[PDB]
RNA sequence: ACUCUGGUUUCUCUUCAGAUCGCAUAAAUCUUUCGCCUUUUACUAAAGAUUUCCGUGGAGAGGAACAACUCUGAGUCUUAACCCAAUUUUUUGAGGCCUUGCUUUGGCAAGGCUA
């Protein structure tokens, strides 16, 4: 039962799931080119390690 | 008046949605400006960006019901009584002859002769 209402709960929320992850995909990385990462900012010094 | 064309309704599913998805209209979250400010949870009201929800359209697919009933479109869209021709063709007086030029000859070109 408890998978039934998952799966059905998870059913309805496939109207628009694809659309706002690729959005959510398409949108961290516009701010990601402005605010890199913290790790990505320090990997040219961590090689040289 | 000929022949082929071949639905409508309903229940699901999968996707795409420009468009007033909706001649209607909610909520949440985040970031800014405020209003309350004393801390949550509620909020104040504008802007901006999201998400969810109540619904919607198109197309595709699969079942069911009325599957048997006809459409539309296309195809050549197919018939005789009595009445008719001076602008294009079954009633239309448009005939012939000759000259000279010219063509390898045939013929052609122009003019003349009519009745």
């Known amino acids: 039962a408890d998978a039934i ?3 059905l709960d998870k059913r309805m929320d496939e109207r628009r ?3 706002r992850e690729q959005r959510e995909k398409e949108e961290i990385e ?3 080119m402005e ?3 913290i790790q990505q900012q ?3 010094l961590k090689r040289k390690l």
């Open 17 to 19: 799931k694809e659309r």
């Open 42 to 44: 320090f990997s040219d």
């Open 5 to 7: 209402y998952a799966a």
């Open 35 to 37: 605010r890199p990462k």
């Open 30 to 32: 516009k701010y990601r």
